[PDB]
Amino acid sequence: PKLEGASVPVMSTSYDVVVDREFDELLQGKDGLLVYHKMLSDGTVKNALNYIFGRIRSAKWYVEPASTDPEDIAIAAFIHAQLGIDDASVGKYPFGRLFAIYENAYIYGMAAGEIVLTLGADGKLILDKIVPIHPFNIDEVLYDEEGGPKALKLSGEVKGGSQFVSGLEIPIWKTVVFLHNDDGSFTGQSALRAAVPHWLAKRALILLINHGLERFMIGVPTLTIPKSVRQGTKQWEAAKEIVKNFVQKPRHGIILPDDWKFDTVDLKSAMPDAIPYLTYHDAGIARALGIDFNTVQLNMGVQAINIGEFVSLTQQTIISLQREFASAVNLYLIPKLVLPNWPSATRFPRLTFEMEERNDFSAAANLMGMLINAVKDSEDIPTELKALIDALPSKMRRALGVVDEVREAVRQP
Amino acid sequence: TVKNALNYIFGRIRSAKWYVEPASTDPEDIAIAAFIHAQLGIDDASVGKYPFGRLFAIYENAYIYGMAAGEIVLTLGADGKLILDKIVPIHPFNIDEVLYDEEGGPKALKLSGEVKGGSQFVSGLEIPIWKTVVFLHNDDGSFTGQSALRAAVPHWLAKRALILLINHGLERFMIGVPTLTIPKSVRQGTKQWEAAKEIVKNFVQKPRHGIILPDDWKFDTVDLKSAMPDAIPYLTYHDAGIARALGIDFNTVQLNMGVQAINIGEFVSLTQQTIISLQREFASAVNLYLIPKLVLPNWPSATRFPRLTFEMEERNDFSAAANLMGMLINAVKDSEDIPTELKALIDALPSKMRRALGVVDEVREAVRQP
């Protein structure tokens, strides 16, 4: 008596004017990718990405085992060594390449890498390299009859210009795929999508301000002459010179016959101060990414006392990005490193990170001191200490940090 | 502003320190809860096993649109138990209707949409409720969900209309509206008419060009009679009102800028009351639709179920709670078995004191026994 499979296929997020999550024509195709690429040249976008991408990488990445069983510890230790998990999250070369690919998926909606294995020095199959696949070079995702992804179809120029590759198909099981903000249909979306209106408004507004500034700074010179003066006279040339010189040589000064009148246009108000409106839109670029402190004003001006709370609010956005990254690693990469070496493996180690929400360090370090004090008189302080830690209620245990049993197994010489 | 608010709310929901509570302290309920803990991959960061994050994404669609669902697919696992294979997400754009029995209870979802990749159109596919997890947002008891964004619509519309009006206002006050008064002699298609149009055009486009006029032509800009009204506070009233309408109790547009309340943390605490309600709505669906589906095929006479739950995060009491934890450790430090004596003492504490320390997770302890 065998179990039923899925009766519902994966379906596109499509209704009426919305086709595969998108209503806007200009952001729809691969032509939409050109908009997001152009956004990377904006200083506010780049500032936000530097912060977000840096914070994600700094999240104290480690490997948790599928269980506390000796065998799951050993498998997890192997993955730990493959990535070069360390205190700064520097790692072995391919680890940083995975974040770079994920950054492309954040910007564009989706990116991928080909996983290449090689024979290790001890007989195991090990990660050789990750070949990055850019969304500029993805034609389409190919699907099975249930709407599950099966392959990527690629077209692009081989770097160095040796040849054009046309419709190369790569099976999904040879890849890690990163999707940003998947709604369940297997369609990624650029994180910059909600920032486009503010970005456009910021640009239009800089153009408007620059033009306003000219007229209010210089003045628009007017010269009224007798209707007897006509074009191509020496009189006319003199009128032209006066107007030109007012703009270019303000020190020259103006000598007029008494029937010629010079004035600048009366704008009849002071220049409108458009700076707060500009910064509303400019700062709104970073708000649209889920950043909860003002990235344009930064430390300047009267503000909330407690800026750290706003950094903590921002962590809720960034921590979701870390889970999105970890999820793809855990689904696409780790099983593909384990199964060649352990073919009957049913459960897998997981890449994970330390939750950084609030600064509770001073309180937690004081608790740590109290724990040590308690098992001080002990014969084996490290063992008593760790036993005591694992007995603690969740909030207390987590505030100290991770007791990394996988790291322990890796570091045993 | 919508996207900013959703990033915060959905991030905080997922960060709630999700765990599994057993139906009772009985050994068997602990064992069943441990099985559920292992299915989801419950861990300190709430990363989890693949389908765990998939449940949240479905719930997010329900928050945005009112309703979403997933098909629960089971498979035979390594040790003989029926385990969770996958959750197939069902988007509201592809739900035709909910089908009901004669008592008005839900019996099935009827679905229509294009299979991803465009291989075929699926038409009127019926899925029994017992094969699904259904997420409704803000169910009033009639089994009708409602978008969380409903009360934000008027502010969102107002914000958009105001940006347009401000943009329009800014041009006339920035540039000016040029006027040129000329003799009634001048007619269209004169050299003179061309020069008139050029003056007006160049005033807009080339203010440095300057203007030479016969003494019977007068140039001016329109007198607007006063300075441009400052519409920014009204705009931000409506804009920030979008996030207010979701139950966020700090200003998401101004953020850290401007003179403010000293205690921003209190407003983050107020906001938690909204977000904690969303966590219970999510937990409720998992506890009703998913957990019993995973338990019953393995324990067919199970009458009581483990529950997905979370740590209440309302206030920051950590310094005081950590100090209490130290006082407790110090009182049992002379014990031959500090771990056992500590947990015994913690369970005996009055409720406020006990909860502030965190969860003594006996399901986790069972799971971690090698």
Add this chain to the structure above:
Amino acid sequence: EGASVPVMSTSYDVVVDREFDELLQGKDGLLVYHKMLSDG
């Protein structure tokens, strides 16, 4: 066996090898950045 996908250029439409802006392409681009070093 090794890779079945080559490393490809980040090119599509007016974007050639990551750049759309003529004035910042090639070694002429490097002159702009060099000039920027004399800004305080």
Add this chain to the structure above:
Amino acid sequence: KALKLSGEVKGGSQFVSGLEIPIWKTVVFLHNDDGSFTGQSALRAAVPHWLAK
């Protein structure tokens, strides 16, 4: 595989033209490599503000 180099030797003794050096003889630093082995100046996004200033 290689860098192809051209420039004047410091002191002006000769012009070097199309000299090829294999990558295994070098350390290469790229800034903000997107996976294509193309670096990009950190100053790219600062250009509009610099011009405006």
